[PDB]
Amino acid sequence: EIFKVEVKNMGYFGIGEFKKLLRNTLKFDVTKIKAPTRKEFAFVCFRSQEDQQRALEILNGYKWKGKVLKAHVAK
Ligand SMILES: [Cl-]
Ligand SMILES: [Cl-]
Ligand SMILES: [Cl-]
Ligand SMILES: [Cl-]
Ligand SMILES: [Cl-]
Ligand SMILES: [Cl-]
Ligand SMILES: [Cl-]
Ligand SMILES: [Cl-]
Ligand SMILES: [Cl-]
Ligand SMILES: [Cl-]
Ligand SMILES: [Cl-]
Ligand SMILES: [Cl-]
Ligand SMILES: [Cl-]
Ligand SMILES: [Cl-]
Ligand SMILES: [Cl-]
Ligand SMILES: [Cl-]
Ligand SMILES: [Cl-]
Ligand code: NA
Ligand code: NA
Ligand code: NA
Ligand code: NA
Ligand code: NA
Ligand code: NA
Ligand code: NA
């Protein structure tokens, strides 16, 4: 089943940097990322609901690449 979020207020970023944050720094089990413009927003899907819930708790308020990130569930 699908456990998706949208990360917002990202400013400019690289996909390598973002996948590092999610998978190396925060140890999320990421199944998929759609951030095609490399700015402002990224959709992410996690293998478990636990990581989706974890991503929303952590990323809301998380200072990264000069920005205070926000995140919400995505359908
Ligand atoms: Cl920026
Ligand atoms: Cl932004
Ligand atoms: Cl960029
Ligand atoms: Cl990068
Ligand atoms: Cl990039
Ligand atoms: Cl990096
Ligand atoms: Cl990081
Ligand atoms: Cl985690
Ligand atoms: Cl992907
Ligand atoms: Cl799409
Ligand atoms: Cl992408
Ligand atoms: Cl592209
Ligand atoms: Cl689950
Ligand atoms: Cl988890
Ligand atoms: Cl919050
Ligand atoms: Cl924080
Ligand atoms: Cl800063
Ligand atoms: Na934004
Ligand atoms: Na980085
Ligand atoms: Na890792
Ligand atoms: Na693309
Ligand atoms: Na748009
Ligand atoms: Na922070
Ligand atoms: Na959405």
Which of these, 10, 8, 16, 7, lies nearest to 64 by C-alpha position?
Answer: 10
Looking at the structure of the chain, the number of domains it has is: 1
- Distance from residue 14's CA to the centre of ligand 6 (Å): 8
Sheet holding 42-46, edge to edge: 30-34, 42-46, 3-8, 70-74
* Full domain range(s) for residue 13: 3-74
Q: How was this structure determined?
A: X-ray
Q: Report yes or no: 35 and 41 within 8 Å, Cβ to Cβ.
A: yes
Closest CA to 49 of 20, 28, 26, 24: 28
CATH of the domain at 33: 3.30.70.330
Nearest to 7 by CA among 48, 19, 50: 19
Give the ligand at the shortest distance from the Cα of 72: 24
Contact 10, 43 (CB under 8 A): no
Give kind and range of the element (H or E) at residue 62.
none
Do residues 9 and 69 touch, judged by C-beta distance below 8 A? yes
Residue 37 CA, ligand 12 centroid: distance in Å: 7
Residue in 6, 54, 60 with CA at minimum distance from that of residue 29: 54
* Resolution of the experimental model, in Å, one decimal: 1.6
Q: How far is the CA of 70 from the centre of ligand 23 (A)?
A: 11
